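Hi support team,

I'm opening this ticket because the web form for multi-chain structure prediction keeps timing out on my end. I have pasted the exact lines I submitted so you can reproduce it. The total is 501 residues across five entries, so I didn't expect it to be a heavy job. Is there a limit I'm missing, or should I split the entries? Thanks in advance, R.K.
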Amino acid sequence: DLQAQRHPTTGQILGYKEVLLENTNLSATTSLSLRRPPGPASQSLWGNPT
Amino acid sequence: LARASSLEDLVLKEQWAIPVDATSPVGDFYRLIPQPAFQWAFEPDVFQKQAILHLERHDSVFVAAHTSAGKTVVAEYAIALAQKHMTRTIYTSPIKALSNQKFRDFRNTFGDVGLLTGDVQLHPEASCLIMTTEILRSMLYSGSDVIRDLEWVIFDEVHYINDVERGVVWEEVLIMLPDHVS
Amino acid sequence: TMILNLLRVDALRVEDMMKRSFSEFPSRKDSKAHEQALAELTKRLGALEE
Amino acid sequence: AEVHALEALIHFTKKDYLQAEKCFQRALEKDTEVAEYHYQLGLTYWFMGEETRKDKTKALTHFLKAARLDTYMGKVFCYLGHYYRDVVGDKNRARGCYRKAFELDDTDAESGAAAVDLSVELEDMEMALAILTTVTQKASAGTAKWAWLRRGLYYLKAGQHSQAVADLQAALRADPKDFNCWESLGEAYLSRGGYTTALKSFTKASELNPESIYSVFKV
RNA sequence: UUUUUU
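Hello R.K., no limit was hit. The queue was backed up. Here is the completed structure from your submission:
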């Protein structure tokens, strides 16, 4: 992801360093957590199987 | 330093339901909460002041009042707090005809209020969506990505649980609600 | 509709909703006391000789 | 004679002026009042006068040492111990006497915020959380942003987003203009589920201080 | 011989 860095006090962007993502291989139709990708697209609010 | 270093370092070393009293406690509503999220043209009564005192800490009230015009002060202070925090709030009414004038009054009182019902879908992107409970029950079974931004769910008339053909909706909703939603 | 919307999902079973219903509250109110009494009274039977 | 009064007035005049008079006031006070605790007031005045320009490795530093040996019971010598441990001289005992000077004389955020910040900069962390909790009960309505922000970030390092968001919300309710708090709160919402509240918060963060690239990029 | 929601 190339995440930002933060000064330990009054956090300021020292530099951008790459780290490993951890909640990939997670999907909207096979996972029930608030970490999954948002959704297919703008979509019908209700009435959605799968 | 050797002696001064030491001379400095030696000196250097369950109930689950709280029946808050109706009348007695509150005496000081303005010392704390000096910037209320909403300001009326009159004085909020004692029990409404206590309810606001507990809504500040993000607790979960159960108002049970007499007059229909006393509860909506809490019901719009929660929306003022929601707009202050940038989050979203869902006000849910059972009657299809009751959720029209409530919509009118909430759009007139402040900013953006979307409405969702069986046929109306005015602005389904606002921060005070007004719906019928069967629509919240239908978008709890799927994700619908609105649940990601909620703070408050204002069940308006929760004494319809005693109904014979719709009392199961209120309990399917009260069960499926995630934990971060007061 | 309830049965369909819960069989569809894998990590949720239909008896969970039945357990959590208000009409089951009196039976399921002091449930933690029931399991603690069972798990610490099974110990007390674990005393007697065969 | 006005011994204490005249010396104090001369020191005050020296403070109003440059540190030239300070050398005379310090020498006169040290020569005249030979003590350790009553002398500690003149020692602290001489160190406050000398700290402007003088290096004072022995004139004020030993004076501050005598004032530290004259540590008073109540709210009279903790700030001296804090200022004595500024940057050097066994920084671990410097952290110890910040902890002592803020544990005894916990009065205002100014001393309090610097004290807690320097405490948390050292390795130990599970002591800062208790301090933050203690300050948190005495937060009346806002007006404790120096505590709220640090405790929110400290809660942000762990995966405990509910309390962290609440803390940052309280901090902004205190004063809703520091863009750093808005950006950090937006990041807090984005760490957990919320997507449109993070967007709204980041837009608000960028609208004021429109110089910040990170906020617009995140938007 | 009234009332109600996807």
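A quick check on our side: The two ends of chain C are 53 Å apart (CA to CA). Let us know if the file doesn't open in your viewer.
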